[PDB]
Amino acid sequence: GYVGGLPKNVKEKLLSLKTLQSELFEVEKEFQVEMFELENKFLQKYKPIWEQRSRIISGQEQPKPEQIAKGQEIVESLNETELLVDEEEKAQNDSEEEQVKGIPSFWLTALENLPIVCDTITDRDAEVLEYLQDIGLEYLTDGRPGFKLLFRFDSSANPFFTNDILCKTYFYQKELGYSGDFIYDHAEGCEISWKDNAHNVTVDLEMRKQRNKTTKQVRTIEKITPIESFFNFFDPPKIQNEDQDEELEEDLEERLALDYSIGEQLKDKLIPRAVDWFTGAAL
Amino acid sequence: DSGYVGGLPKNVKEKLLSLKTLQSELFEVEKEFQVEMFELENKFLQKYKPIWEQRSRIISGQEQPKPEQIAKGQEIVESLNETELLVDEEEKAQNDSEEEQVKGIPSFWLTALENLPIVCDTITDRDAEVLEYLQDIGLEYLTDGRPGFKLLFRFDSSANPFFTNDILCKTYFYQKELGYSGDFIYDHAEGCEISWKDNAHNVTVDLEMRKQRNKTTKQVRTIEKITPIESFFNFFDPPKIQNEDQDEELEEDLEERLALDYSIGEQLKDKLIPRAVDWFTGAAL
């Protein structure tokens, strides 16, 4: 205030500082573009590792002796001696071992250990998550900057929906939010092609067969009511803000905070750290 | 669950070991990514250097704004709300001879630090007295030698009465390996020895003097005593370790002092200097 009340030398110097602030903001925009470029570059390196562990998880690929030995040495260095093999386990025959190809409930176990997301999982969700093979992540290059999430389900054996893959998208605002980070814009996601309502874990179901007391027509009914589930992660909050959504926008904002927290958790912890979160060592 | 872990078939344990190996490879990739980020950040620090130097010249009064920069600032003021800078008729009547009697921006950096939440707690009035002579706050990235960043504080020896050092700097150091989350993690920090002009001006100590005809020792003797005290300039001379005392005393020392010190260093580096102006006016809050 008084700095404005100070002579126009001080005001004019502040004006120059603000012009330099705008120029610095331009340099900052350049830096942000550069760091997203670098992040994409190294995400291309992340993807092979994540896909490899996903193939191991689903059982689509097998380990190798050198990898097992390296993990042995690392675990001994980690002090997490629980993973260590014992002779009683060695006694198991191959016929006993191959009864399951992938790690049972790998992701479900990992998501159960993960702090916030585990609260979202219901029993039917847990059963569904058993068919979850992989979680993949991607960055949005066009238009608004943002990052996208992918899940792969073995839809062939999945009894609940035909969606081979589900994708979830996040958006950021146009300009650099203050403090030189990117702040969120609303999110969008897929809709699930449930095979039927009984198998729809986002829904609880009622069956009714009736003869209408008013018209005396004969009818059989299939009825639906939505419920909370891990897959409420999809059907994300509709819009950041719009005139018709305001009453919805209350829930959209709250669920947006929660869903951004969930996605941030996935992005930083789970997809970059899966093994420890499965084993619980990440706790 | 230990029981479930035991239940894991030997094949499943082998697969888990392979997965942990993959996680280690991921940590290696994260190391490479952090190296690239550090180098790019150094490059854009080089690009920031001109603008920061120019604003420093403006702050010190060594340079005067041009009408072009003035008009651009006026436009940016018309944007959002900064009409505090819109110059009024009463000021245009003034003359540079009257205005330039105060050259530069009084207490620009001291004001900037005080608005900064965490660090301002450490600054005392005795520290503050030095900070009016602060006219620059600079960053350096320790590309050579141990990784980390160094902070630079500048003064005028001919102006300040406290020390003969034109520049005071603080340093922070990282471990050779990344943290678990993939971010950088810390090593012991170090600070400069302040070349105080005299102990009386020195602000990291409180002193007392006595004189005794000590019959207990039959000594006509003069004595001096020095006590460390709390002050922001304790931000320099950070803690160090000695093995035996380390595990009892410096364990808690490292638990507390290092946490506060790293928090303050990162807060300066990230929040303050890139927004050196908004923090001074307070808009950066």
Numbering used by the authors:
A (entry chain E): 83 to 365
B (entry chain D): 81 to 365
Report text from the authors:
The importin Kap114 transports H2A-H2B into the yeast nucleus, where RanGTP facilitates histone release. H2A and H2B contain disordered N- and C-terminal tails and central alpha helices that fold together into the globular H2A-H2B histone-fold domain, with very basic surfaces that bind DNA in the nucleosome. These same surfaces are shielded when H2A-H2B binds the Sc Nap1 dimer (Nap12), which is mostly localized to the yeast cytoplasm where it chaperones newly synthesized and folded H2A-H2B. The mode of H2A-H2B recognition by Kap114/IMP9 is well understood: the superhelical Kap114 wraps around the H2A-H2B histone-fold domain, occluding the histone’s DNA-binding surfaces and functioning as a histone chaperone. Here, biochemical and structural analyses show that Kap114, H2A-H2B, and a Nap1 dimer (Nap12) associate in the absence and presence of RanGTP to form equimolar complexes.
Nap1 alone is a mixture of dimers and tetramers, while Nap1 binds H2A-H2B to form a mixture of a Nap1 dimer (Nap12) bound to one H2A-H2B (Nap12•H2A-H2B) and larger Nap1/H2A-H2B assemblies. For comparison, we also performed cryo-EM analysis with a mixture of Kap114, Nap12, and excess H2A-H2B without RanGTP, which produced a heterogenous mixture of particles that included unliganded Nap12, the binary Kap114•H2A-H2B complex, and small populations of two different assemblies containing Kap114, Nap12, and H2A-H2B.
